[PDB]
Design a protein around this ligand. Structure first.
Ligand SMILES: *[C@@H]1O[C@H](CO[C@@H]2O[C@@H](C)[C@@H](O)[C@@H](O)[C@@H]2O)[C@@H](O[C@@H]2O[C@H](CO)[C@@H](O[C@@H]3O[C@H](CO)[C@@H](O)[C@H](O)[C@@H]3O)[C@H](O)[C@H]2NC(C)=O)[C@H](O)[C@H]1NC(C)=O
Ligand SMILES: *[C@@H]1O[C@H](CO[C@@H]2O[C@@H](C)[C@@H](O)[C@@H](O)[C@@H]2O)[C@@H](O[C@@H]2O[C@H](CO)[C@@H](O)[C@H](O)[C@H]2NC(C)=O)[C@H](O)[C@H]1NC(C)=O
Ligand SMILES: *[C@@H]1O[C@H](CO[C@@H]2O[C@@H](C)[C@@H](O)[C@@H](O)[C@@H]2O)[C@@H](O[C@@H]2O[C@H](CO)[C@@H](O)[C@H](O)[C@H]2NC(C)=O)[C@H](O)[C@H]1NC(C)=O
Ligand SMILES: *C(=O)N(C)c1cccc2c(CN(C)CCC3CCCCCC3)c[nH]c12
Ligand SMILES: *[C@@H]1O[C@H](CO[C@@H]2O[C@@H](C)[C@@H](O)[C@@H](O)[C@@H]2O)[C@@H](O)[C@H](O)[C@H]1NC(C)=O
Ligand SMILES: *[C@@H]1O[C@H](CO[C@@H]2O[C@@H](C)[C@@H](O)[C@@H](O)[C@@H]2O)[C@@H](O)[C@H](O)[C@H]1NC(C)=O
Ligand SMILES: CC(=O)N[C@H]1[C@H]([C@H](O)[C@H](O)CO)O[C@@](O)(C(=O)O)C[C@@H]1O
Ligand SMILES: *[C@@H]1O[C@H](CO)[C@@H](O)[C@H](O)[C@H]1NC(C)=O
Length: 526
């Protein structure tokens, strides 16, 4: 099957899914490849082609450094790129139902990876199940990451910052101009993403140039006000300069520095990216979103607080054990291959790793609020507190604060707490319900009976998929038929949220109230 787009015809491929068919268009280009003089610049519009573009395989993933912390371990390597790395990577994917829909709602996935890694071609982002089961169209795109996507000398168009965010935006634009030709509804577009993808979605809610390019938004385990998600303009400059020094590209004319960095080979840039920070952490974001005066007109805490964002519905949520995955990437006494019982001294050293530039008093205050136990003899006490510290600070409390602030301006918001640990999880049990492991439920992988998930997991994915699709189509994440628990709107008064698990979906109130009053009220003062 062949589709005529505004820039030329593209050929897809038929996929067998669940005794039906999905048409997949894998690797459609949506911008001029950002090479040569175009490196670090905003994405340029694509010149029309006259042939038939063969969109039958995922395209190159963008240049990025690979996680090598556990070679051979599927738990970490499933997140690594699975196509060739290349600067020529501005491509997107489309899954459409077969038979071709008339006016399907469109879901646009933006992957995470700390703005330094990720790719749309990961197995857990395969949108063919969503298209088969709910008859939505799933779009996903690759966007530039790391220095190549977020290097910033702000106000200077040779490297203005936020390029990877403009990559995303130009793909959103592509959907507006072309998706009706695939049977999609440009007026019914929901962005969803996880971690830096969710942070990206929250910044699209804030960017005026994205407001006309989507309807609704879903934020999984991330939002821009998370402490790792926005690079200050001070650091962005100190980091651009450091990378210049590492690469032998220090000049005086700022533009001349970028010209120098433009002649460097991609691997030279990538290898020096790591050491541009003085004190890195497992959650470090070397080159990330900045206030550029283009995509972001002001500091986003200010825009959020004062109601300067797209008025629409949002679905936001977090996982029960967001923080535990990151403890094996640096915290002493931790290991995925043992139960990681750490001492009080190890917990204190762990705070130094995760809060490097924080004062002594600030680290003590973290310790004070997370080490008054129900049982002081519980030998896992400090292991779980450090996971809770990292998860509350970096994910849960920023998600809740975003949802509170956003809803205060009249919009319906829906908050979830995901507490099911995948039965096939290759990580150890002490890490519980890890960051990133709701994604496969959202994308409906457990609906495939051949893939040795439990039956209760098939049902949970089925209900989750229906709720996501109803949110995108109707602004309302209900499952209205199988006598499901009604998902109430999150209000700033009562702060109700829905728990997602295989046993009982409960409605609860005021998630992590005590912990988040420490993080969002006390801790920013330190
Ligand atoms: C596909 O469906 C859309 C409607 O999509 C729905 O409405 C959105 C606002 C979102 O809430 C979506 O989640 C939701 O599913 C149809 O859009 C319709 O487009 C036509 C023109 O393209 C609009 O016609 C209007 O006609 C009046 C009077 O003649 C004019 O004055 C207006 O200027 C305007 O052109 C129509 O309002 C609009 N419908 C809605 C509800 O906004 C779209 O036509 C449809 N396409 C197909 C092929 O089915
Ligand atoms: C801002 O930048 C300076 C310079 O960074 C150093 O040089 C870069 C090329 C890169 O290799 C970094 O890792 C280097 O640290 C930072 O100054 C350094 O500060 C650390 C302690 O914070 C100190 O041990 C180094 O000796 C310093 N090096 C130099 C050359 O001054 C500085 O810390 C950065 N950040 C801030 C907030 O000032
Ligand atoms: C859990 O493991 C950590 C990490 O040690 C590594 O992994 C082990 C499974 C084993 O294969 C070791 O040989 C590895 O080095 C242990 O932390 C280390 O403990 C030693 C003291 O024995 C210390 O000198 C190291 O610095 C520690 N390494 C780190 C990264 O902290 C930890 O003691 C183990 N805990 C339990 C309860 O098994
Ligand atoms: C979201 O994108 N987040 C939370 C984020 C921030 C900074 C770096 C990130 C990386 C890459 N490395 C540092 C960690 C890889 C882990 C992530 C946990 C899931 C399973 C283990 C692999 C990824 N995400 C970020
Ligand atoms: C584009 O695709 C055309 C159609 O052929 C199909 O694609 C190739 C790759 C084979 O898998 C074939 O069995 C398929 O039916 C090709 O004839 C054409 O060469 C392709 N052109 C380019 C530039 O790739
Ligand atoms: C809803 O449930 C379907 C099967 O459940 C059966 O049908 C419902 C109406 C009840 O009678 C129940 O007791 C039966 O076991 C699933 O096939 C379907 O996928 C489910 N849909 C969603 C959105 O969860
Ligand atoms: C960087 C990269 O992936 N380049 C190209 C690859 C490789 O050059 C070869 O497969 C050898 O590895 O091959 C293609 O031409 C192909 O045949 O589909 C597509 C792709 O653009
Ligand atoms: C730097 O070089 C550019 C041309 O490459 C020039 O336009 C500019 O004036 C020079 N000086 C500064 C301060 O940018």
């Amino acid at each position: 099957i062949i589709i005529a787009t505004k820039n030329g015809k593209v050929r897809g491929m038929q996929l067998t899914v669940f005794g039906g068919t999905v048409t997949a268009f894998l690797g459609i280009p949506y911008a001029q490849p950002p090479l040569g003089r175009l490196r670090f610049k905003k994405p340029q519009s694509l010149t029309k082609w006259s042939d038939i573009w063969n969109a039958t395989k995922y395209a190159n993933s963008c240049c990025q450094n690979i996680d090598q912390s556990f070679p051979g371990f599927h738990g970490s390597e499933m997140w690594n790129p699975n196509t060739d790395l290349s600067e020529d990577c501005l491509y997107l994917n489309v899954w459409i139902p077969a038979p071709k829909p008339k006016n399907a709602t469109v879901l646009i996935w933006i992957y995470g990876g700390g703005f330094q890694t990720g790719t749309s071609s990961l197995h857990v982002y395969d949108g063919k199940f969503l298209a088969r089961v709910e008859r939505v169209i799933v779009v996903s795109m690759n966007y530039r990451v790391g220095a190549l996507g977020f290097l910033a000398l702000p106000g200077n168009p040779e490297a203005p910052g936020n390029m990877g965010l403009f990559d995303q935006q130009l793909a959103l634009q592509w959907v507006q101009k072309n998706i009706a030709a695939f049977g999609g509804n440009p007026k019914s577009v929901t962005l969803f993403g996880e971690s830096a993808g969710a942070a990206s979605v929250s910044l699209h809610l804030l960017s005026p140039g994205s407001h006309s390019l989507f309807t609704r938004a879903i934020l999984q385990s991330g939002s821009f006000n998370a402490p790792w998600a926005v690079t200050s303009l001070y650091e962005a400059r100190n980091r651009t300069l450091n990378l210049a020094k590492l690469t032998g590209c220090s000049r005086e004319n700022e533009t001349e520095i970028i010209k120098c960095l433009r002649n460097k080979d991609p691997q030279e840039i990538l290898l020096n990216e790591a050491f541009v920070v003085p004190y890195g952490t497992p959650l470090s974001v070397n080159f990330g979103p900045t206030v550029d005066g283009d995509f972001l007109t002001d500091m986003p805490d200010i825009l959020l607080e004062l109601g300067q964002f797209k008025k629409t519905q949002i679905l936001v949520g977090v996982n029960k054990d967001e923080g535990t995955a990151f403890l094996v990437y640096g915290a002493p006494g931790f290991s995925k291959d043992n139960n990681s019982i750490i001492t009080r001294k190890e917990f204190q050293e762990g705070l130094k790793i995760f809060f490097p530039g924080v004062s002594e008093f600030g680290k003590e205050s973290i310790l004070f609020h997370y080490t008054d136990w129900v049982d002081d003899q519980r030998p896992e006490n400090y292991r779980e507190a450090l996971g809770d510290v990292v998860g509350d600070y970096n994910f849960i409390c920023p998600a809740l604060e975003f949802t509170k602030k956003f809803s205060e301006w009249g919009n319906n918001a829906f908050f979830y707490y995901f507490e099911h640990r995948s039965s096939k999880l290759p990580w150890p049990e002490w890490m519980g319900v890890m960051h990133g492991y709701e994604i496969e439920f959202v994308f409906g992988l457990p609906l495939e009976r051949r893939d040795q998930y439990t039956k209760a997991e098939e049902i949970l994915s089925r209900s989750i998929v229906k709720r996501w699709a109803n949110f995108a189509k109707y602004g309302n994440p209900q499952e209205t038929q199988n006598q499901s628990t009604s998902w109430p709107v999150f209000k700033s008064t009562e702060q109700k949220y829905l728990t997602l698990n295989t046993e009982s979906t409960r409605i609860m109130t005021k998630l992590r109230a005590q912990q988040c009053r420490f993080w969002t009220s006390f801790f920013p003062k330190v």
